[PDB]
Design a protein around this ligand. Structure first.
Ligand SMILES: Nc1ccn([C@@H]2O[C@H](COP(=O)(O)OP(=O)(O)OP(=O)(O)O)[C@@H](O)[C@H]2O)c(=O)n1
Ligand SMILES: Nc1ccn([C@@H]2O[C@H](COP(=O)(O)OP(=O)(O)OP(=O)(O)O)[C@@H](O)[C@H]2O)c(=O)n1
Ligand SMILES: Nc1ccn([C@@H]2O[C@H](COP(=O)(O)OP(=O)(O)OP(=O)(O)O)[C@@H](O)[C@H]2O)c(=O)n1
Length: 161
């Protein structure tokens, strides 16, 4: 996605839950750091379209495999640690502004395929407890994750009853 006037790239994030209130947790490709799926919003994409493209390209799933249960309204932003800022572009990107989606997986676990890209976002995934991501994502994304998971909590725990 294109860097905006303030240095932020527009992006979407995806929290995928099951009926037991667990959420899909994925290992960043070639790292031991885990996160939710996130991807850029291209010009002429809506947030929801960009979400479904991320879902297909990095999780292998269709609209028909999920249902949308909630979404955040306005951007939430994180800034990159200055060490990880890439200076090989103009304008330089300092972080992301993100819109988030809560999806329920309704197809079988085996429909998820994280290996279809030549450069996958992830090595693979596992189910984790709902709040585990807030404490386990890389530090500079924790403020965003805490806000997202708090906003989505009302909907997920009702399913887990
Ligand atoms: N746990 C993490 C998260 C991020 N990064 C680094 O910080 C950059 C920015 O991370 P992020 O904002 O999550 O975006 P990307 O992973 O680069 O993904 P995208 O191409 O969709 O922007 C990454 O390229 C990576 O070098 C990292 O090293 N370890
Ligand atoms: N990580 C965050 C947190 C907040 N906001 C912006 O700040 C608003 C929330 O402000 P508030 O709840 O009042 O918290 P703070 O006073 O900023 O602390 C959101 O709509 C968002 O636009 C953001 O962009 N990125
Ligand atoms: N509670 C928060 C956290 C973040 N933000 C927005 O999201 C960006 C990322 O937040 P943060 O990393 O915490 O900013 P800092 O680099 O710590 O400090 P400064 O932003 O003042 O240069 C902020 O610029 C802000 O616009 C916000 O409005 N309210």
């Amino acid at each position: 996605s294109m860097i905006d006037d303030d240095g932020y790239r527009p992006n979407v994030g995806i929290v995928i839950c099951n009926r037991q209130g667990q959420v899909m947790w994925a290992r960043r490709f070639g790292q031991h750091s885990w996160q939710f799926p996130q991807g850029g919003i291209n010009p002429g994409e809506s947030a929801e379209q960009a979400m479904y493209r991320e879902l297909f390209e990095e999780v292998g799933l269709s609209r028909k495999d999920v249902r949308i249960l909630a979404s955040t309204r306005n951007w939430l932003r994180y800034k990159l640690p200055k060490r990880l800022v890439r200076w090989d572009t103009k304008p330089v990107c300092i972080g992301q502004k993100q819109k988030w989606f809560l999806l329920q997986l309704v197809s079988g676990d085996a429909e998820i395929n994280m290996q279809t890209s030549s450069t996958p976002e992830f090595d693979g995934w596992r189910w984790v407890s709902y709040w585990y991501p807030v404490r386990q994502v890389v530090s500079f994304k924790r403020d965003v994750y805490r806000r997202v998971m708090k906003e989505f909590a009302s909907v997920v725990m009702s399913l887990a009853a």
